[PDB]
From a paper:
X-ray diffraction by the γA9EC1–5 and γB7EC1–4 crystal form 1 crystals was significantly anisotropic and therefore the data was truncated using ellipsoidal limits for structure determination and refinement. The resolution of the final refined structures was 4.2 Å for γA1EC1–4, 3.6 Å for γA8EC1–4, 2.9/4.3/3.2 Å for γA9EC1–5, 3.5 Å for γB2EC1–5, 4.5/4.5/3.6 Å for γB7EC1–4 crystal form 1, and 3.1 Å for γB7EC1–4 crystal form 2. The γB2EC1–5 and γB7EC1–4trans dimer structures show the same overall arrangement as the previously published γB3EC1–4 trans dimer structure. In addition, residue R340, which is also conserved in all γB isoforms, is positioned so that it could form an additional salt bridge with E41. Thus, a putative heterodimer formed between any γB isoform and any γA isoform would position a positively charged residue at position 41 in the EC1 domain of the γA isoform in close proximity to K338 and R340 in the γB isoform, which would significantly weaken binding.
By contrast, in vertebrates the clustered protocadherins (Pcdhs) provide analogous cell-surface diversity, but in this case generated through stochastic alternative promoter choice. Biophysical measurements with domain-deleted proteins showed that Pcdhs also interact in cis, through a membrane-proximal dimer interface involving extracellular cadherin domain 6 (EC6) and potentially EC5.
Author numbering:
A (entry chain A): 2 to 413
B (entry chain B): 1 to 414
Write the structure that this text describes.
Amino acid sequence: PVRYSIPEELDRGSVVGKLAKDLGLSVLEVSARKLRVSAEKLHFSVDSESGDLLVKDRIDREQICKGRRKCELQLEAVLENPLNIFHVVVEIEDVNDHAPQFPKDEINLEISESDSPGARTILESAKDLDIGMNSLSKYQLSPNDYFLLLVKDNPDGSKYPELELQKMLDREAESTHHLMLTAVDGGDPPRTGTTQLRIRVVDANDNRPVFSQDVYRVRLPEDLPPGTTVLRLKAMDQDEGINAEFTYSFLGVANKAQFSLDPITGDIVTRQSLDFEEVEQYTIDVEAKDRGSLSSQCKVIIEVLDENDNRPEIIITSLSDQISEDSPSGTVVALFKVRDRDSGENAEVMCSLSGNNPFKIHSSSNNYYKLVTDSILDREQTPGYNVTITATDRGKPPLSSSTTITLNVADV
Amino acid sequence: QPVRYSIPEELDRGSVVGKLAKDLGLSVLEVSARKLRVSAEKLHFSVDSESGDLLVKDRIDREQICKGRRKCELQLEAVLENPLNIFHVVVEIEDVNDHAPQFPKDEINLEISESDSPGARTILESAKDLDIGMNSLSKYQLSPNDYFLLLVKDNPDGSKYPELELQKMLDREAESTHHLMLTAVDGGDPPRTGTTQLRIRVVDANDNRPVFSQDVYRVRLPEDLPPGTTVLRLKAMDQDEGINAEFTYSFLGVANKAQFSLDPITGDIVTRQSLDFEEVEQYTIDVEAKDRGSLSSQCKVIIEVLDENDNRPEIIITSLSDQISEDSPSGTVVALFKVRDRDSGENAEVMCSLSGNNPFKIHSSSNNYYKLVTDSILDREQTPGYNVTITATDRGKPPLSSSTTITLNVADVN
Ligand SMILES: *[C@H]1O[C@H](CO)[C@@H](O)[C@H](O)[C@@H]1O
Ligand SMILES: *[C@H]1O[C@H](CO)[C@@H](O)[C@H](O)[C@@H]1O
Ligand SMILES: *[C@H]1O[C@H](CO)[C@@H](O)[C@H](O)[C@@H]1O
Ligand SMILES: *[C@H]1O[C@H](CO)[C@@H](O)[C@H](O)[C@@H]1O
Ligand SMILES: *[C@H]1O[C@H](CO)[C@@H](O)[C@H](O)[C@@H]1O
Ligand SMILES: *[C@H]1O[C@H](CO)[C@@H](O)[C@H](O)[C@@H]1O
Ligand SMILES: *[C@H]1O[C@H](CO)[C@@H](O)[C@H](O)[C@@H]1O
Ligand SMILES: *[C@H]1O[C@H](CO)[C@@H](O)[C@H](O)[C@@H]1O
Ligand SMILES: [Ca+2]
Ligand SMILES: [Ca+2]
Ligand SMILES: [Ca+2]
Ligand SMILES: [Ca+2]
Ligand SMILES: [Ca+2]
Ligand SMILES: [Ca+2]
Ligand SMILES: [Ca+2]
Ligand SMILES: [Ca+2]
Ligand SMILES: [Ca+2]
Ligand SMILES: [Ca+2]
Ligand SMILES: [Ca+2]
Ligand SMILES: [Ca+2]
Ligand SMILES: [Ca+2]
Ligand SMILES: [Ca+2]
Ligand SMILES: [Ca+2]
Ligand SMILES: [Ca+2]
Ligand SMILES: [Ca+2]
Ligand SMILES: [Ca+2]
């Protein structure tokens, strides 16, 4: 069978080939023998004037052949008296008229921030109706720091592009990315189909909640009433949504014996008054944990200020009841000292006696005070003295405590 | 000038603090005659008349009376009577390493998120050492492991607290729970160690995407399969646990599920409309699995349709001659026709036959054209016209046959 070649999509009236001239049929014979050229679901014509094969229907190679490697239409021609049938084979040359194009111009992708580097995400492949050289040739994308592109082929022979990311993403730095994806076919001239990809990063739980300060310090007096909001804590989570909701908790145990913490507000209050003489300062560890297991710890130390709330006590360590009547001036009759629970200026003491007695009080080293008689005494005036001595503090407000003691002298 | 003595704590009763009477020169006569009393605040001491020395009466605990204070000086005093007098004594208590460092709790339970960034720090409860000075806490050390490293830092009060610094990020899909040893050692002779075992439980994060068993699924199906058929069941797993392990299947491609439906709970993919091999021979579909997060994984499922002999062959008469010459020789062509079958393969090959009563015979030219010629001469006087029935039968199971009846007439030139 005679074979001819013709590029597709040719204009009507184009000359495929001179098959009648190839068979040596004269114009008289072409006219006399009714010459009809037939193909399956197609029309062709031969005009009596030129007696050649001319196209009658615009032919699309991609419509009738699709993915077939080569296209050969087996047309036939009919002659009559004498009657005969002839077979001709026609090859349709492909023309790069169908540019590669993506199913959708805009492609939206949602990728998790927590995705590991080196992951792969398959994308919709491009479509090129052209076959062979004019088919799709290569995929290339806009250059970016985050992403790299790979091209792999599925079993039917088409090429699909998938994305491999070199560096893990972070929406707290850049939330959304826009990129350009291009597909190019191998032909002259080359045509390109472009689709812009919009990638939005969804929040993960990779940022821990962080306090404003690493160490919190506040100074409080021991007379502060319970229920007082001693401190307010501050913390923030750079995440968003469920991954950004956190609560405060006392990491230490038994430190909140008199303390309370509101995790909703972050507040720290006291439920029982403090005593400087018991514990001078508290060190507590408080940690914030979000809905995930991300937790962060900060240390809160508080110092208690001493207040003059403890009165001084007088203690007579020793005293002499039987005193000789001939005692001279400067004779020691009693010994005592003072004790104060407070500290600082609230601990220093100033003490005094009644003054009706001749007795005078001297101060020795430490806080020990000797009670002596400054003048000689006669028993006829008074045989025994009871003395009331007052000891007053030096802090605000001064606390004074007094003691009465009895001493008797007999002259024999 | 007050006399000073030094004594280690926790001494037995009857121990000699110092020879205060000989240091003051009182002698046994004055110690016995003049009532000598040794007094301190909240403490007891005794002087035996025979030796006239300072003896302890109460076991003294330096941590009890001093706690965190830098130095310990008990201000003793001595009292004499007739004549009565007071003397000042200062006694320093030397610390003895008798209190071992001990942590507040023996068992430490910690919950750490797998997604925690490497290099993070987590403060732990500090140990307590009642001893002051040298005998106080000195260093923290833990059992060596690849994931964790230990740091020791001091808070404002002067104590040492340990915090954990992570070198390599954890992964509970590899090892769920870790057990470690925390040790605190004080600087004394002999050194004492307080040890607490800490239990770390790694909590699941959303770092593992769900993955299918295979990347490419392929199945072959016949076109006669009824709709509603469960075409395939998909299998996939998420190495995470809990909410982060619940995922659904979805059609990544668009319009590919025109006749397909997918139940993501079971993972099933069914067909809702019958297929036609002559329309689309093979389907390529992209299916993706997505968890509660945006972690997604893609697999490609391609299916092939099997051709079934459901399309019978059609006979097409391209040309025919109504007036046939009576002088027609043997082998002259009276008709031309061809056969067309939509199917492919053996289901496309055809075998056709005619009645055979007529002299006509069919010989095959190129393609599927069978040129209808007459093998023998016929005369019109015997029979002027023939009815011819030609039957075309398929070659696939079950054979499909279609026939056409053409009329041929003979004309006499005379
Ligand atoms: C795609 O790329 C081709 C070159 O391969 C260009 O000619 C076209 O304009 C588009 O940019
Ligand atoms: C992407 O870019 C191409 C040019 O290369 C355009 O023709 C197309 O419409 C899309 O904007
Ligand atoms: C001792 O002195 C104080 C004032 O310093 C008084 O408030 C107290 O009642 C006592 O007389
Ligand atoms: C000094 O004053 C106190 C009261 O402040 C008395 O209790 C004491 O007996 C002395 O007279
Ligand atoms: C802690 O460490 C000290 C010195 O390393 C040991 O003496 C003690 O028994 C404990 O192991
Ligand atoms: C923890 O471990 C130490 C030794 O490191 C022991 O001495 C201690 O009694 C506890 O078992
Ligand atoms: C034509 O012939 C086939 C068998 O060759 C039959 O099955 C069909 O029904 C028709 O009669
Ligand atoms: C040709 O043969 C077919 C199949 O046998 C018949 O159905 C038809 O009527 C004609 O006789
Ligand atoms: Ca075209
Ligand atoms: Ca084309
Ligand atoms: Ca193309
Ligand atoms: Ca981040
Ligand atoms: Ca985040
Ligand atoms: Ca968080
Ligand atoms: Ca107080
Ligand atoms: Ca106080
Ligand atoms: Ca006071
Ligand atoms: Ca001790
Ligand atoms: Ca000790
Ligand atoms: Ca110790
Ligand atoms: Ca993991
Ligand atoms: Ca995980
Ligand atoms: Ca997951
Ligand atoms: Ca069918
Ligand atoms: Ca079929
Ligand atoms: Ca068939």
